[PDB]
Design a protein around this ligand. Structure first.
Ligand code: AGS
Ligand code: AGS
Ligand code: AGS
Ligand code: AGS
Ligand code: ADP
Ligand code: MG
Ligand code: MG
Ligand code: MG
Ligand code: MG
Lengths: 322, 337, 322, 314, 477
């Protein structure tokens, strides 16, 4: 996969997040690299920067000896018997070839990922295991982790990337893998994968490896990308909005039946309808009020795991009654 | 009958040439087979496509399969012994027999199966009945074991699926079969079983009455072939299952009579339908979509019925006693009409 | 090196602020010697733990480490804990001491009904030879029997005078410069939480301690704490009230995306601003409050955030039309 | 110091006030002797444990120390315990009067795991000649079906106001304390049936402020004053209600749960408004309560509740 | 003594003609226990006339308090056997089962020998009947108990009788086919009524038949609960301790209570206390009988139907609240709200005069039936999964209508020679006779099969059974 081949392995390949690398480079020259708490939206590059700094400061051979990676599996016995032990293991002796190139600090690195849904007792033990003997723990909701941990660890908000700095790197990928793409496809992959970036890379990889089966060598057109991510195409959405713009109950019911039967079985049509009805400039304010309210109501209904056919039919009938 | 003529290989599928082409293209790279997420309406033939892709990548020995039992230890002292239908090269998990042990049993069984030894397939039937904890554990296993486990998740209307799952697998949709292809696949069956068809319109009629449901169309054709002495003529009284007739009679009673003296019988019929292994959401959906087809109603009544049904569907998905919400919906319907 | 939470912890009674009403009655209890079972409840970061530890230290002095049992949350919470540890600590006597022993449970509201029944039975058993003092955050998650058996004490949040006195004190023992509006923002954000104040002060310290003498402006405090700025809030409200749909939507998206704010605090600040407007019609306020409460309750379950944002805009624009 | 709840705990079966038919049934049981296995269910603080204790005392006379086995939540009740100790106690020899029997009192039976409750079945069925079980549970639903089938179910109704008032009158008469009628009414309002909590609050008021008066009660209970809650709910202008909720209740640091519970308990006693408006206001208040209990206790929810209540009352 | 014993123990049955209800299952168990010796002589391979000759052990199951233990003990004692009983109050682990009972599996009794061995009464006096009672009640402290007992179900040498409450529980899966499983059902009201009349005549005190029917409806058929409740003993008794839910339903549905003069005499607090009087049966009773009253509180322009609709809406809201409450008991504080939404508001909306009689709630029986049928459908799917590739819910929805046309449809027209074809069909899916009956049980609607299954001659059914007992193809693992 391309996500691991072109994973940022050093501190300068990252281009989306810039506010977080400068301060770590500033702290680099001192042995006072403290405990730290990374948080933000998924697919931002957090683990990439963590692995990059560990590789830059510790060396390739020692990666598995003193740099440890732990995740969210199923306990307290793990902390009291292994994680504390892993914290108090006598660090291995970095050989001369390591000192030749890498300045070694006098402490170990233990990476606990997904610190969000952890139990408070494990945290009360983990603060003690880290204070008496460094750590880089990660979560996506800072509210759930207890305060005694965040007291000694300095916080870093890994901001979600914007549409501006995300293109060039993606463009770089299009040059690095000899993938032939269409003209207006990159920003489409960006907006369908808005916020997160690794999903865009997986989408590009899937689209390339799928189009290559056809043997055409043709530009990967946008409909392939829109079909891969499961979003409803623009033609079917145009048909829906045209049918609902002026139509009786029977025609809307029959068309939504055909849609739920053979059409795109995703419930993302409400998102496309919201985007189209809000970003448009043809409907007045009193219309958009009820449009937004009905869309919110239908989304709150669909969020409860109910049936999508009835909710979609109700939403279409209500948006037609206006 | 219906299981008799079922494709056991990619060459044997006579529907949706595009998907068969994509599947035979995927089956040419056994070393790299990404995780798959199949979605689409019921009765479309996605499990058949799973077991046919497995037949094409592996040997024909995938279809011989046996059921085993494996034991795990939960949080409490109730050590669970759960069944699993497996094959020499794959296994199937249906997380509907258990309700809350999902996030534990999924991760534990997957981590045990990853370490028994070139990979093994795990088909998660009904991948929409997994709570967010179960899906989180599933994505954890997907991140951990990528060299020996290849998940092929079968589901329908994949809205209740967390985004890290969607990102880490290839999404595939299986549209319902058009009436034309249903006609051909039914002609194949009536030819192989020497059925005396009077005309070819009965096939299109069954296809239209099945609402794009392939297996329901086949089952209805078989059920109606055992009533006319295997001689299906133009006078074909299309037979519905034993429960749809009761729902249609209840709809006719609701439309014809609007009073509490009829509401008592409606509650009795709802009891009789619910006690006999029929869910609540299916009853509500069927009653709603049968109350909208009546000709005696106008647009306002239908627009109110659909709203009441949309509200009571959430109320059914939020409560534990279904007869309460069903009777409330019927009462509101009778109040509107 | 020690956190300011622990470093600035009150060692005595006089070092707690803004709790005179309970401190006077606690001093009456301790000099009278009739210390009953206590229930210290209130918002977090108020001083319950500090108060009770200071009282125990004053009562027992050096023997505090002998007759004071400081228990905590679950820590493998079986019935065995309440059945053995507390029971033997209450039934067995003490050596080389005079008085009754003290058991203090931290956040004892996370106990199930059975655990609370066991604990109330233990309290009723040895009520003559030991005194219980239980801490809590919400006084409603406790069995009414356990609440009645003891005397309650609600720790109201710290007013301006107390927190400003503590800021002065932390400015004595630290070399720091703080702007007059920085403390105002700090109090407006604290809500009366001393723990969060001590959390944010040292973080901004470590952030801007280049010469140990910089001025802590409000922007860096807002960035470290992650709270909305009143200027951005008022700008978003004005844009939603006056400008059209496209412009207001773009401004809301840019504000909540370029800063890293969630819709919760957006709605909170917006309704807090709208509280004091001179409205003409009351139906406006009715619809506004009802719809925004519905939006908040739906956000609490995590829907499609863009749809709830559009719904917020629509509700604000549709309520302000009378 | 001594808790008045413990000092004035009823020791005879006649001293218990409240339910009359069930107390008469227990009196006839203690007079006859043929007591069957019985589950006692009801709300907390209404006299369940006291009832079975006085029953066992009056039944066994001078044998309570020999033929009574009490197991509350503070004791180990697993599978090993119910298998060894309860069985060995049921098989014990004891020469009792021709009517009496041994007594095993299990308190908070709803806390016993299902595996432990399964073992007691044959133990209580085979030794019905010299052992009668008495369970005291809050919820009769967590008890397994076989146990519920074996022993008779006895429900205790919540205490009314005249009974608690008479009990408090007896207490204050035997304690010689000064009081006022509105103070007793405040005690009745806050107790909501809990006789134990009523006695505890009365003792706390007497020990803290001496004179039992509504102001001292509402000060010591640390709950929103019912008068200010009634003024907030019955205001004419919605802005007035919002301001009252802001400057009086929300600023003083009251918990939202307490505010909603006090609004519920005041709307229940608002005898000036009609019945339908009372029921619908209670419905909206309960909706807000359920919304708060789900993690969102924002002031906005209370503001919306007040807005809905004002729109309803208008 | 005479007056110190309980009413359940003193009035317990003594012979087999006093056990009320389930005569068929008792007779089947007795015949199996009687012909067990002849089946043992033939190596447990020739099913004689009832398909109950290949089964080594028997399994009793059903609702609580029907007579399972009593029937087992009585049929064991009547044939002259010696009873070796083990229950849940004994540690039935794997090692202890191997130690204690495994050794006594095939041995002969010493008490049975020294009791009576000179008179020619019966040759089965020394033999054992091992009664494993409360097998469903094995907690986590009995490791491997189910597997070891399933192994004991085979390779045994003495009649083994297992007793449980929920047979279709997946934990009881190892007892799939190795044991004859007969089912006890809730006895008919007539037998329980006759037993109650006999007990009341012996105790010399008369009751109203309406009270007896109301008791039978309240206890849902548990005869033990009925006797234990009758032992508590007339208007005050039924109106204050026994039939309290009915009084709550009658008082909360009165029209004069919600009138202004009436509401000032009976305020809302009295109604909420009336609900708390029994907070487990009042909502169900209200939901049962809220739409069968002639109202007197309708607004000026409100019909019956829309009032009932609003009541049902508030009922659904109260049900949601009840689910939220029971999801976490520590939310006890939500009980008052559930009082107004579930019980008080609908009654207030549709109060008035009772049209007929107040009926007990029917939701409990329907819920039990639905759970039993769900478990039966899951058990059928466990067998038929290897040849359908369908969900446990879609099976009942789609396949069974065709299974009816395959299984029973030949019998109505072809008579009795189409047995081979239907056995061949049901063996492609690993289906058995109990599964056949369970399948036919489900057909609700115009395709009801309970009338037709009995209409067919008994000779055809007996021939089907005896022909199926010969050939079997159940192995697929
Ligand atoms: N700034 C970036 N530049 C280039 N590639 C990036 C960048 N950020 C993320 N990626 C890619 O996205 C992948 C995601 O890796 P991670 O750092 O684990 O993301 P994440 O934020 O940890 O997601 P989680 O673990 O679900 S919270 C990386 O391996 C890169 O391939
Ligand atoms: N009244 C106070 N005066 C001075 N410092 C205080 C005060 N309240 C809190 N602090 C500071 O905040 C820290 C935490 O105080 P705690 O008493 O532990 O909080 P709490 O009020 O007991 O509630 P918790 O700990 O969140 S459950 C103390 O160590 C002090 O540094
Ligand atoms: N009917 C009553 N008459 C007089 N005092 C009563 C009455 N009911 C309760 N009390 C008092 O309340 C105290 C506590 O009652 P208990 O019976 O112990 O409570 P409970 O019924 O066991 O409910 P729990 O234990 O909280 S679940 C008794 O010691 C009495 O002082
Ligand atoms: N058919 C019956 N006729 C009369 N009394 C009966 C009948 N069945 C049960 N009883 C009474 O119920 C008492 C005990 O019933 P059991 O059969 O032992 O209960 P059970 O069937 O074992 O159900 P479990 O084990 O409690 S789940 C007997 O002593 C009788 O008093
Ligand atoms: N290409 C095909 N040719 C013939 N029958 C098919 C084909 N695809 C699917 N089917 C029918 O679909 C049925 C299986 O449906 P299934 O996959 O279980 O539904 P679902 O997709 O809802 O799980 C089979 O009985 C088979 O007859
Ligand atoms: Mg990561
Ligand atoms: Mg503290
Ligand atoms: Mg008690
Ligand atoms: Mg029994």
């Amino acid at each position: 996969p391309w996500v691991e081949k072109y994973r940022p392995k050093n501190l300068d390949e990252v281009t989306a997040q810039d506010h977080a690398v400068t301060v770590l480079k500033k702290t680099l020259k001192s042995a006072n690299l403290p405990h730290m708490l990374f948080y933000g939206p998924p697919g931002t590059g957090k683990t990439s920067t963590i692995l990059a700094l560990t590789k830059e400061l510790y060396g390739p051979d020692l990666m598995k000896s003193r740099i440890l990676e732990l995740n969210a599996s199923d306990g307290i016995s793990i902390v009291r018997e292994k994680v504390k032990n892993f914290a108090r293991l006598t660090v291995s002796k970095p050989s001369k070839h390591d000192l030749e190139n890498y300045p070694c600090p006098p402490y170990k690195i233990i990476i606990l990922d997904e610190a969000d849904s952890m139990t408070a007792d494990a945290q009360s033990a983990l603060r003690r295991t880290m204070e008496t003997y460094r750590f880089c723990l990660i979560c996506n909701y800072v509210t759930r982790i207890i305060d005694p941990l965040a007291s000694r660890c300095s916080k870093f908000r890994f901001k979600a990337l914007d549409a501006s700095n995300a293109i060039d790197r993606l463009r770089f990928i299009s040059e690095q893998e000899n993938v032939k793409c269409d003209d207006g496809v990159l920003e489409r992959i960006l907006d369908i994968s808005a916020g997160d970036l690794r999903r865009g890379i997986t989408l590009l990889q899937s689209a390339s490896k799928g189009a290559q089966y056809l043997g055409d060598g043709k530009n990967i057109t946008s409909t392939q990308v829109e079909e891969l991510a499961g979003v409803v195409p623009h033609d079917i959405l145009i048909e829906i909005v045209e049918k609902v713009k002026s139509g009786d109950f029977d025609e809307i019911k029959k068309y939504v039946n055909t849609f739920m039967k053979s059409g795109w079985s995703a419930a993302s049509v409400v998102n496309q309808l919201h985007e189209y009805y809000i970003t448009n400039d043809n409907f007045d304010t009193n219309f958009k009020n009820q449009i937004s309210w009905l869309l919110f109501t239908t989304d709150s209904r669909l969020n409860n795991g109910t049936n999508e056919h009835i909710q979609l039919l109700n939403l279409l009938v209500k948006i037609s009654q206006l | 009958w219906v299981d008799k003529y079922r494709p056991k290989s990619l060459n044997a599928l006579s529907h949706n040439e595009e998907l068969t082409n994509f599947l035979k293209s995927l089956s040419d790279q056994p070393r790299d087979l990404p995780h798959l997420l199949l979605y689409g309406p019921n009765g479309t033939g996605k499990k058949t496509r799973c077991m046919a892709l497995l037949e094409s990548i592996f040997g024909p020995g995938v279809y011989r399969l046996k059921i085993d039992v494996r034991q795990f230890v939960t949080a409490s002292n109730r050590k669970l012994e759960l069944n699993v239908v497996s094959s020499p090269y794959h296994l199937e998990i249906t997380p509907s027999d258990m309700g809350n042990n999902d996030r534990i049993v999924i991760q534990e069984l997957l981590k045990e199966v990853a370490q028994m030894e070139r990979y093994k397939c795990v088909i998660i039937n009904e991948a929409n009945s997994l709570t967010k904890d179960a899906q989180a554990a599933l994505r954890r296993t997907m991140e951990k074991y990528s060299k020996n486990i290849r998940l092929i998740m079968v589901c329908d209307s994949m809205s209740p699926i967390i985004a890290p799952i969607k990102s880490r697998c290839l999404l595939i949709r299986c549209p319902a079969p058009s009436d034309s292809e249903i006609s051909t696949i039914l002609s194949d069956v009536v030819t192989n079983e020497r059925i005396q068809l009077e005309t070819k319109d009965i096939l299109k009629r069954i296809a239209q009455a099945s609402n794009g449901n392939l297996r329901v169309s086949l089952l209805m054709l078989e059920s109606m072939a055992l009533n006319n002495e295997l001689a299906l003529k133009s006078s074909s009284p299309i037979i519905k299952p034993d429960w749809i007739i009761v729902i249609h009679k209840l709809t006719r009673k609701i439309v014809k009579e609007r009073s509490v003296n009829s509401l008592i019988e409606c509650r009795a019929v709802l009891y009789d339908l619910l006690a006999h292994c029929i869910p609540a959401n299916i009853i509500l959906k069927e009653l709603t979509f049968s109350l909208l087809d009546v000709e005696t109603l106008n647009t306002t009544n239908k627009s109110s019925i659909i709203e009441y049904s949309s509200v009571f569907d959430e109320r059914l998905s939020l409560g534990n006693k279904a007869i309460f919400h069903l009777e409330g919906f019927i009462a509101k319907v009778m109040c509107c009409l | 090196n020690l956190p300011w939470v622990e470093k600035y912890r009150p060692e005595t009674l006089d070092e707690v602020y803004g709790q005179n009403e309970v401190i006077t009655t606690v001093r009456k209890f301790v000099d009278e010697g009739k210390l009953p079972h206590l229930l210290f409840y209130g918002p977090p970061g108020t001083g319950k733990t500090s108060t009770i530890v200071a009282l125990a230290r004053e009562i027992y002095g050096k023997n505090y480490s002998n007759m004071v049992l400081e228990l905590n949350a679950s820590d493998d919470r079986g019935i065995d804990v309440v059945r053995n540890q507390i029971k033997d600590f209450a039934s067995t006597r003490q050596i080389f001491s005079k008085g009754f022993k003290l058991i203090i449970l931290d956040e004892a509201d996370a106990m199930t009904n059975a655990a609370q029944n066991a604990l109330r039975r233990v309290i009723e058993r040895y009520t003559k030879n030991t005194r219980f003092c239980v801490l809590a955050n919400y006084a409603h998650k406790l069995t009414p029997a356990l609440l009645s058996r003891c005397t309650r004490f609600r720790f109201q949040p710290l007013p301006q005078e107390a927190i400003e006195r503590r800021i002065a004190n932390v400015l004595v023992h630290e070399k720091l410069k703080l702007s007059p509006n920085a403390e105002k923002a700090l109090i407006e954000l604290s809500n009366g939480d001393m723990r969060r104040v001590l959390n944010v002060l040292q973080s901004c310290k470590a952030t801007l301690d280049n010469p140990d003498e910089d001025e802590i402006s409000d922007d860096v405090i807002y960035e470290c704490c992650g709270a909305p700025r009143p200027s951005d809030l008022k700008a978003v409200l004005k844009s939603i009230l006056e400008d059209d749909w496209g412009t207001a939507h773009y401004t809301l998206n840019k504000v909540r995306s370029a800063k890293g704010l969630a819709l919760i605090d957006l709605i909170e600040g917006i309704v807090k601003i709208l509280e004091d407007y001179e409205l003409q019609n009351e139906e406006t306020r009715v619809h506004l409050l009802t719809k925004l409460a519905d939006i908040e309750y739906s956000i609490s379950k995590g829907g499609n955030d863009q749809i709830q944002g559009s719904a917020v805009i629509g509700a604000i624009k549709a309520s302000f039309e009378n | 110091q001594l808790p008045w709840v413990e000092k004035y705990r009823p020791q005879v079966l006649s001293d218990i006030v409240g339910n009359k038919e069930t107390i008469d049934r227990l009196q006839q049981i203690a007079k006859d002797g043929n007591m069957p296995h019985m589950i006692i269910s009801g709300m907390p603080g209404i006299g369940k444990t006291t009832s079975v204790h006085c029953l066992a005392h009056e039944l066994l006379g001078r044998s309570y120390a020999d033929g009574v086995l009490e197991l509350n939540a503070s004791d180990d009740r697993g599978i090993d315990v119910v298998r060894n100790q309860i069985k060995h106690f049921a098989q014990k020899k004891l020469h009792l009067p021709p009517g009496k029997h041994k007594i095993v009192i299990l308190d908070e039976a709803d806390s016993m795991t299902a595996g432990a409750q399964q073992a007691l079945r044959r133990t209580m069925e085979l030794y019905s000649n010299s052992t009668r079980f008495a369970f005291a549970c809050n919820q009769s639903n967590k008890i397994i079906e076989p146990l519920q089938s074996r022993c008779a179910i006895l429900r205790y109704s919540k205490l009314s106001d005249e009974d608690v008032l008479k009990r408090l009158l007896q207490i204050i008469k035997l304690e010689d304390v000064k009081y006022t009628n509105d103070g007793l009414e405040a005690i009745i309002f806050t107790a909501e049936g809990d006789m134990r909590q009523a006695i505890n609050n009365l003792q706390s008021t007497v020990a803290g402020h001496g004179l039992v008066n509504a102001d001292n009660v509402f000060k010591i209970v640390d709950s929103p004053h019912p008068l200010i809650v009634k003024k907030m709910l019955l205001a004419s202008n919605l802005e007035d209600s919002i301001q009252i909720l802001r400057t009086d209740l929300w600023k003083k640091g009251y918990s939202s749960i307490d505010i909603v519970t006090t609004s519920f308990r005041v709307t229940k006693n608002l005898a000036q408004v009609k019945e339908s408006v009372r029921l619908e206001m209670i419905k909206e208040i309960g909706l807000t309560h359920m919304r708060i209990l789900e993690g969102v206790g924002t002031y906005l929810q209370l503001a919306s509740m007040l807005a809905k209540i004002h729109k309803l009352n208008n | 003594r005479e007056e110190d014993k309980l009413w359940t123990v003193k009035y317990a049955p003594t012979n087999l003609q006093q056990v009320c209800g389930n005569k068929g299952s008792v007779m089947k168990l007795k015949n199996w226990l009687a012909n067990w010796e002849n089946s043992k002589k033939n190596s447990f391979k020739h099913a004689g006339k009832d398909g109950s000759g290949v089964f080594r052990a028997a399994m009793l199951y059903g609702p609580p308090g029907i007579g399972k233990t009593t029937a087992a003990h009585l049929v064991a004692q009547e044939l002259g056997y010696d009873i070796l009983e083990q229950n849940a109050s004994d540690v039935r682990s794997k090692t202890l089962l191997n130690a204690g009972v495994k050794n006594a599996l095939d041995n002969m009794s010493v008490v049975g020998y020294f009791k009576h061995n000179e008179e020619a009464q019966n040759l089965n006096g020394k033999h054992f009947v091992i009664i494993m009672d409360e097998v469903d009640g094995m907690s986590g402290g009995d490791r491997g108990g189910v597997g070891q007992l399933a192994q004991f179900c085979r390779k045994t040498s003495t009649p083994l009788i297992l007793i449980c409450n929920e047979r279709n529980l997946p934990k009881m899966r190892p007892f799939d086919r190795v044991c004859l499983d007969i089912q006890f059902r809730r006895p008919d009201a007539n037998s329980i009524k006759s037993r109650l009349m006999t007990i009341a005549i012996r105790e010399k005190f008369k009751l109203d038949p309406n009270v007896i029917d109301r008791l039978i409806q309240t206890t849902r058929g548990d005869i033990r609960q009925v006797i234990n409740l009758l032992s508590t003993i007339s208007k005050a008794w039924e109106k204050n301790i026994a039939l309290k839910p009915f009084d709550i339903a009658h008082k909360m549905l009165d029209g004069q209570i919600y009138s202004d003069i009436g509401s000032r005499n009976f305020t809302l607090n009295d109604k909420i206390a009336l609900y708390f009087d029994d907070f487990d049966f009042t909502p169900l009773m209200i939901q049962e009988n809220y739409l069968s009253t002639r109202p007197s509180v309708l607004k000026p322009g409100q019909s019956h139907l829309e009032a009932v609709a609003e009541a049902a809406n508030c009922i659904s809201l109260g049900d949601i609240v009840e689910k939220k409450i029971r999801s976490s008991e520590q939310l006890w504080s939500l009980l008052p709200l559930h009082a107004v939404l579930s019980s008080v508001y609908p009654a207030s909306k549709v109060a008035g005069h009772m049209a007929g009689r107040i009926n007990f709630t029917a939701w409990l029986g329907q819920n039990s039936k639905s759970a039993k049928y769900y478990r039966l459908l899951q058990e059928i799917h466990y067998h038929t999964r290897l040849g359908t590739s369908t969900d446990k819910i879609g099976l009942r929805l789609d396949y069974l209508p065709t299974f009816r046309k395959r299984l029973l449809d030949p019998f109505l027209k072809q008579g009795a020679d189409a047995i081979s074809s239907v056995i061949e069909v049901m063996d492609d899916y690993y289906l058995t006779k109990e599964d056949w009956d369970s399948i036919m049980e489900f057909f609700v609607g115009p395709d009801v099969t309970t009338a037709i299954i009995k209409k067919i001659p008994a000779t055809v059914k007996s021939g089907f059974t005896r022909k199926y007992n010969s050939m079997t193809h159940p192995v697929a693992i």
